[PDB]
Write a protein that holds these residues in place. Structure first.
Motif, PDB file in Angstrom:
ATOM      1  N   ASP A  41       0.931  -1.412   0.104  1.00  0.00           N
ATOM      2  CA  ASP A  41      -0.047   0.003   0.153  1.00  0.00           C
ATOM      3  C   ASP A  41       0.797   1.232  -0.065  1.00  0.00           C
ATOM      4  O   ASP A  41       1.748   1.411   0.916  1.00  0.00           O
ATOM      5  CB  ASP A  41      -0.888   0.034   1.224  1.00  0.00           C
ATOM      6  CG  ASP A  41      -2.093  -0.929   1.129  1.00  0.00           C
ATOM      7  OD1 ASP A  41      -1.918  -1.825   0.253  1.00  0.00           O
ATOM      8  OD2 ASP A  41      -3.092  -0.850   2.097  1.00  0.00           O
ATOM      9  N   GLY A  42       0.472   2.013  -1.048  1.00  0.00           N
ATOM     10  CA  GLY A  42       1.471   3.476  -1.012  1.00  0.00           C
ATOM     11  C   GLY A  42       2.850   3.533  -1.514  1.00  0.00           C
ATOM     12  O   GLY A  42       3.410   4.270  -1.658  1.00  0.00           O
ATOM     13  N   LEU A  43       3.098   2.149  -1.996  1.00  0.00           N
ATOM     14  CA  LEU A  43       4.534   2.170  -2.780  1.00  0.00           C
ATOM     15  C   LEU A  43       4.202   2.422  -4.360  1.00  0.00           C
ATOM     16  O   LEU A  43       3.327   2.281  -4.722  1.00  0.00           O
ATOM     17  CB  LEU A  43       4.933   0.745  -2.632  1.00  0.00           C
ATOM     18  CG  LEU A  43       5.217   0.227  -1.189  1.00  0.00           C
ATOM     19  CD1 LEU A  43       6.071  -1.341  -1.279  1.00  0.00           C
ATOM     20  CD2 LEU A  43       6.039   0.984  -0.352  1.00  0.00           C
ATOM     21  N   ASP A  44       5.148   3.079  -4.853  1.00  0.00           N
ATOM     22  CA  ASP A  44       5.344   3.208  -6.317  1.00  0.00           C
ATOM     23  C   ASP A  44       5.713   1.998  -7.004  1.00  0.00           C
ATOM     24  O   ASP A  44       5.853   0.877  -6.214  1.00  0.00           O
ATOM     25  CB  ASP A  44       5.893   4.392  -6.676  1.00  0.00           C
ATOM     26  CG  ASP A  44       7.777   4.291  -6.504  1.00  0.00           C
ATOM     27  OD1 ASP A  44       8.156   2.970  -6.702  1.00  0.00           O
ATOM     28  OD2 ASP A  44       8.299   5.202  -6.326  1.00  0.00           O
ATOM     29  N   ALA A  45       5.758   1.816  -8.301  1.00  0.00           N
ATOM     30  CA  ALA A  45       5.717   0.908  -9.024  1.00  0.00           C
ATOM     31  C   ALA A  45       7.054  -0.043  -9.011  1.00  0.00           C
ATOM     32  O   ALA A  45       7.134  -1.279  -8.548  1.00  0.00           O
ATOM     33  CB  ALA A  45       5.587   1.195 -10.594  1.00  0.00           C
ATOM     34  N   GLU A  46       8.219   0.627  -8.893  1.00  0.00           N
ATOM     35  CA  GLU A  46       9.493   0.100  -8.635  1.00  0.00           C
ATOM     36  C   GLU A  46       9.539  -0.250  -7.124  1.00  0.00           C
ATOM     37  O   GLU A  46      10.211  -1.447  -6.598  1.00  0.00           O
ATOM     38  CB  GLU A  46      10.632   1.058  -8.738  1.00  0.00           C
ATOM     39  CG  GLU A  46      12.079   0.410  -8.587  1.00  0.00           C
ATOM     40  CD  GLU A  46      13.139   1.206  -9.214  1.00  0.00           C
ATOM     41  OE1 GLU A  46      13.146   2.167  -9.997  1.00  0.00           O
ATOM     42  OE2 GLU A  46      14.258   0.749  -8.868  1.00  0.00           O
ATOM     43  N   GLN A  47       9.190   0.544  -6.189  1.00  0.00           N
ATOM     44  CA  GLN A  47       9.304   0.001  -4.617  1.00  0.00           C
ATOM     45  C   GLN A  47       8.421  -1.362  -4.606  1.00  0.00           C
ATOM     46  O   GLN A  47       8.889  -2.292  -3.694  1.00  0.00           O
ATOM     47  CB  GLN A  47       8.742   0.935  -3.976  1.00  0.00           C
ATOM     48  CG  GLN A  47       9.521   2.306  -3.893  1.00  0.00           C
ATOM     49  CD  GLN A  47       8.686   3.329  -3.049  1.00  0.00           C
ATOM     50  OE1 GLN A  47       7.596   3.798  -2.881  1.00  0.00           O
ATOM     51  NE2 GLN A  47       9.622   4.324  -2.345  1.00  0.00           N
ATOM     52  N   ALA A  48       7.114  -1.512  -5.220  1.00  0.00           N
ATOM     53  CA  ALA A  48       6.619  -2.663  -4.860  1.00  0.00           C
ATOM     54  C   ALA A  48       7.205  -3.724  -5.581  1.00  0.00           C
ATOM     55  O   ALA A  48       6.939  -5.060  -5.055  1.00  0.00           O
ATOM     56  CB  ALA A  48       4.825  -2.409  -5.596  1.00  0.00           C
ATOM     57  N   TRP A  49       7.661  -3.686  -6.784  1.00  0.00           N
ATOM     58  CA  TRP A  49       8.631  -4.605  -7.315  1.00  0.00           C
ATOM     59  C   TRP A  49       9.747  -5.105  -6.595  1.00  0.00           C
ATOM     60  O   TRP A  49      10.136  -6.234  -6.522  1.00  0.00           O
ATOM     61  CB  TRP A  49       8.964  -4.182  -8.751  1.00  0.00           C
ATOM     62  CG  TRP A  49       9.547  -4.724  -9.934  1.00  0.00           C
ATOM     63  CD1 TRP A  49      10.632  -5.018 -10.396  1.00  0.00           C
ATOM     64  CD2 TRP A  49       8.740  -6.088 -10.237  1.00  0.00           C
ATOM     65  NE1 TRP A  49      10.803  -6.017 -11.364  1.00  0.00           N
ATOM     66  CE2 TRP A  49       9.682  -6.581 -11.241  1.00  0.00           C
ATOM     67  CE3 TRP A  49       7.456  -6.597 -10.162  1.00  0.00           C
ATOM     68  CZ2 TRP A  49       9.331  -7.821 -12.175  1.00  0.00           C
ATOM     69  CZ3 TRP A  49       7.154  -7.572 -10.676  1.00  0.00           C
ATOM     70  CH2 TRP A  49       8.098  -8.352 -11.906  1.00  0.00           C
ATOM     71  N   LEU A  50      10.435  -4.105  -5.891  1.00  0.00           N
ATOM     72  CA  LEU A  50      11.588  -4.498  -5.232  1.00  0.00           C
ATOM     73  C   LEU A  50      11.112  -5.131  -3.770  1.00  0.00           C
ATOM     74  O   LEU A  50      11.870  -6.166  -3.315  1.00  0.00           O
ATOM     75  CB  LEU A  50      12.012  -3.113  -4.871  1.00  0.00           C
ATOM     76  CG  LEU A  50      13.484  -3.343  -4.031  1.00  0.00           C
ATOM     77  CD1 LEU A  50      14.383  -4.075  -4.794  1.00  0.00           C
ATOM     78  CD2 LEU A  50      14.117  -2.277  -3.149  1.00  0.00           C
ATOM     79  N   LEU A  51       9.942  -4.959  -3.388  1.00  0.00           N
ATOM     80  CA  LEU A  51       9.354  -5.701  -2.012  1.00  0.00           C
ATOM     81  C   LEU A  51       9.186  -6.969  -2.411  1.00  0.00           C
ATOM     82  O   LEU A  51       9.798  -8.083  -1.894  1.00  0.00           O
ATOM     83  CB  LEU A  51       8.126  -5.183  -1.654  1.00  0.00           C
ATOM     84  CG  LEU A  51       7.610  -5.717  -0.473  1.00  0.00           C
ATOM     85  CD1 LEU A  51       8.665  -5.935   0.645  1.00  0.00           C
ATOM     86  CD2 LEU A  51       6.328  -5.124   0.004  1.00  0.00           C
ATOM     87  N   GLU A  52       8.559  -7.520  -3.716  1.00  0.00           N
ATOM     88  CA  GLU A  52       8.622  -8.787  -4.185  1.00  0.00           C
ATOM     89  C   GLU A  52       9.996  -9.442  -4.379  1.00  0.00           C
ATOM     90  O   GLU A  52      10.107 -10.745  -4.052  1.00  0.00           O
ATOM     91  CB  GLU A  52       7.962  -8.935  -5.524  1.00  0.00           C
ATOM     92  CG  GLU A  52       6.261  -8.449  -5.412  1.00  0.00           C
ATOM     93  CD  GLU A  52       5.540  -8.971  -6.753  1.00  0.00           C
ATOM     94  OE1 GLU A  52       5.847  -9.483  -7.649  1.00  0.00           O
ATOM     95  OE2 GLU A  52       4.531  -7.802  -6.974  1.00  0.00           O
ATOM     96  N   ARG A  53      10.900  -8.616  -5.021  1.00  0.00           N
ATOM     97  CA  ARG A  53      12.247  -9.285  -5.422  1.00  0.00           C
ATOM     98  C   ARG A  53      12.895  -9.463  -4.112  1.00  0.00           C
ATOM     99  O   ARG A  53      13.620 -10.587  -4.034  1.00  0.00           O
ATOM    100  CB  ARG A  53      13.079  -8.119  -6.286  1.00  0.00           C
ATOM    101  CG  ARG A  53      14.434  -8.491  -6.351  1.00  0.00           C
ATOM    102  CD  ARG A  53      14.852  -9.899  -6.800  1.00  0.00           C
ATOM    103  NE  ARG A  53      14.104 -10.092  -7.945  1.00  0.00           N
ATOM    104  CZ  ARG A  53      14.288 -11.635  -8.345  1.00  0.00           C
ATOM    105  NH1 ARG A  53      15.042 -12.518  -7.467  1.00  0.00           N
ATOM    106  NH2 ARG A  53      13.793 -11.919  -9.494  1.00  0.00           N
TER     107      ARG A  53
END
Ligand SMILES: [Mg+2]
Ligand SMILES: [Zn+2]
Length: 662
Positions: free
Chosen positions: A119-131
């Protein structure tokens, strides 16, 4: 103190090589590991509620000293090693492996990462969390305590074995350099190649003799020209015997441990583990693709072999292939390799070919900086600018073979771009071209020209990076995608208006005649059967080593049976690397990934077509490719990026046409 303890104050963060000495490495590794462990412990034990910033971004910020020492140290160990560096590498690599595992198997740290919402993460931040979650799980974070202990031991043993393979291969390769006592035995070799062999002999402590070092692949270049058949055989035998016997039990152990590791992590083979983080969707997708390519490739190699036998008038041995292929090229196309070499001098290829294409395509410009200090005196440092004059990064070129430099060619980064750290890219290319004596020109084969454009394609991928997080910087993409930007950059080596710009005689500056340059182009479709088969055989060999059910007893027996089972055991077309010198898979990161080249080549050939569809070598097209693909690093899904760029999913027909496989 220690030059690794603070950020470099030099342009672009170029490491201060003039201040760095071997005695700095161990204390910097030790400080770097301790400081990162302390950072990770502070994150894992943070009493504040878990957030992206205090957990994932905090991990991205960690390890600044360790990153700095590693960048220089691993650059040196590949490019310009020595016994002191090799000893450090033996000591440190196991500690680094244990360090990585102390972080990835930190249970509270992983628990914290898992508590972060998208929630509230931008696209690269969300992608990094999964990574981050994926990296941890793939490193064993979800295993029980007993299995984690076994994993730590497997990883450490694997890191030590791969190091030993690399060190064994360098010593044996250097020792297997072919010494020629009589210049008459070099009949057929260009004058420039004779002088290089004399220069090599002088440099390696044998003045008056001639030395022919071995290149990484099975096929040695001099066999195309050397008329002395006994010398051709001697060179080919020296090539194919690298790592025998000292790497045989070693690679068996590596492949065995990889299989045990993969099962511990829930995968039936090492290939299934690898493919789980590749763009290729399944192991079956890889084998199905290779299964389609192999029969037509083999049928092309059989037709080519029949043509070479008719040319020679007799049966051939493997050490005859290149030699008769050159005769056929001369007869068919009027192209004599000795007559082509004078048109391909290193400085001209670099300035008027490699740099020129990048300037025409991307608008970037280059200033050589002979006042900046590289890591070896032959390293050329270049500053790279955008079209608008703004600073982009640094490019270092290290073109020559030497005993301290490992075989092959590669790109690596001294400084990774990220807006997190506000760093600009500093990238390196290493080739293994034979160094001429003082004053003499460096005349290149077309294979070397292609390699220069290839490695430069990796450099551009690094230079153009515009990501937020260092985890995604530059070339940090799956192995089966990373070879796309490198292979696509090779298109410019043969784009006729570029080739015409740089294919000029080293003495006179005269362009190659238009009609001869036409034929030099045509003549590179020649020998695709050999080229494709040696590549596919090496790919299937890698695959067999990383999908076996029962562990092999004997390395050489396994190799034979692997190639025979796969229908690619051709006497005249050995695999591009045999097992005991297959550095790609035993020491570099391409285990169950040597298929990456051809998988990426699909994208490359389809992208060449895109260029033709969109008007060719135009700034608008370079901007598109830079913006949509090269600047993204790992920060977006690579096949999504490709689709946005290309207009659709990739088609394989362009690759099939290129390699004669239709
Ligand atoms: Mg013509
Ligand atoms: Zn590459």
């Amino acid at each position: 103190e220690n030059p690794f303890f603070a950020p470099s104050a030099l342009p672009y963060g170029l490491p201060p090589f003039a201040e760095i000495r071997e005695e700095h490495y161990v204390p910097a590794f030790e400080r770097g590991m301790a400081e990162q462990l302390a950072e990770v412990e502070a994150i894992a034990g943070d009493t504040e509620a878990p957030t992206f910033d205090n957990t994932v971004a905090a991990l991205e910020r960690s390890g600044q000293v360790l990153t700095r020492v590693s960048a220089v140290f691993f650059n040196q160990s590949s490019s310009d090693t020595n016994p002191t560096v090799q000893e450090i590498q033996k000591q440190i690599i196991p500690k680094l492996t244990q360090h990585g595992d102390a972080i990835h198997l930190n249970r509270p740290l992983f628990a914290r990462i898992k508590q972060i919402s998208p929630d509230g993460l931008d696209a690269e931040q969300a992608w990094l969390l999964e990574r981050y979650v994926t990296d941890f799980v793939r490193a064993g974070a979800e295993l029980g305590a007993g299995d984690q202990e076994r994993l730590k031991a497997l990883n450490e043993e694997l890191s030590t074995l791969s190091t030993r393979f690399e060190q064994n291969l360098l010593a044996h390769t250097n020792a297997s350099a072919v010494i020629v006592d009589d210049v008459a035995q070099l009949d057929g070799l260009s004058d420039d190649s004779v002088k290089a062999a004399a220069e090599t002999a002088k440099s390696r402590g044998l003045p008056g003799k001639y030395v022919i070092p071995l290149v990484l692949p099975t096929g040695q270049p001099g066999l195309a020209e050397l008329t002395d058949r006994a010398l051709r055989e001697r060179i080919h035998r020296a090539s194919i015997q690298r790592g025998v016997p000292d790497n045989e039990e070693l690679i068996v152990r590596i492949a065995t441990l990889r299989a045990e590791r993969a099962k511990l992590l829930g995968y039936p083979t090492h290939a299934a583990y690898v493919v789980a983080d590749q763009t290729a969707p399944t192991t079956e997708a890889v084998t199905e693709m290779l299964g389609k390519l192999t029969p037509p490739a083999v049928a092309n190699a059989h037709r080519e072999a029949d043509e070479l036998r008719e040319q020679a008038g007799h049966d051939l041995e493997p050490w005859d292939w290149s030699f008769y292929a050159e005769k056929v090229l001369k007869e068919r196309y009027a192209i004599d390799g000795r007559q082509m070499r004078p048109y391909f001098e290193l400085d001209r290829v670099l300035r008027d070919g490699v740099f020129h294409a990048a300037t025409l395509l991307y608008g970037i410009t280059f200033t050589e900086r002979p006042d900046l200090v590289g890591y070896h005196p032959d390293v050329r440092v270049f500053e790279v600018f955008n079209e608008d004059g703004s600073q982009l990064g640094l490019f270092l070129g290290d073109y020559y073979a030497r005993p301290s430099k490992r075989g092959g060619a590669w790109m690596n980064s001294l400084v990774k771009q990220s807006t997190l750290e506000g760093t600009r890219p500093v990238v390196v290319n290493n080739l293994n071209i034979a160094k001429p004596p003082a004053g003499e020109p460096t005349l290149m084969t077309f294979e070397e020209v292609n390699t220069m454009f290839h490695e430069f394609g990796h450099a551009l991928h690094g230079l153009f990076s515009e990501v937020h997080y260092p985890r995604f910087s530059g070339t940090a993409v799956p192995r089966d995608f990373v070879e796309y930007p490198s292979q696509v950059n090779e298109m410019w080596a043969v784009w006729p208006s570029v080739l015409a710009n740089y294919a000029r005689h080293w003495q006179t500056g005269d362009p190659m005649p238009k009609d001869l340059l036409d034929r030099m182009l045509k003549s590179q479709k020649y020998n695709q059967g050999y080229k494709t088969v040696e590549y596919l055989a090496a790919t299937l060999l890698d695959w067999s080593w990383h999908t076996f059910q029962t562990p092999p007893e004997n390395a050489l027996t396994f190799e034979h049976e692997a190639l025979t089972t796969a229908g690619v055991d051709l006497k005249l077309v050995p695999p591009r690397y045999r097992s005991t010198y297959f550095a790609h898979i035993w020491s570099s990161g391409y285990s169950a990934g040597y298929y990456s080249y051809i998988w990426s080549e699909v994208l490359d050939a389809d992208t060449v077509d895109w260029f033709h569809e969109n008007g060719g070598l135009l700034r608008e097209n370079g901007d598109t490719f830079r913006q949509k693909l090269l600047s993204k690093g790992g920060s977006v899904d690579p096949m999504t990026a490709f689709q946005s760029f290309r207009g659709r999913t990739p088609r394989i027909e362009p690759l099939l046409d290129r390699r004669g496989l239709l």
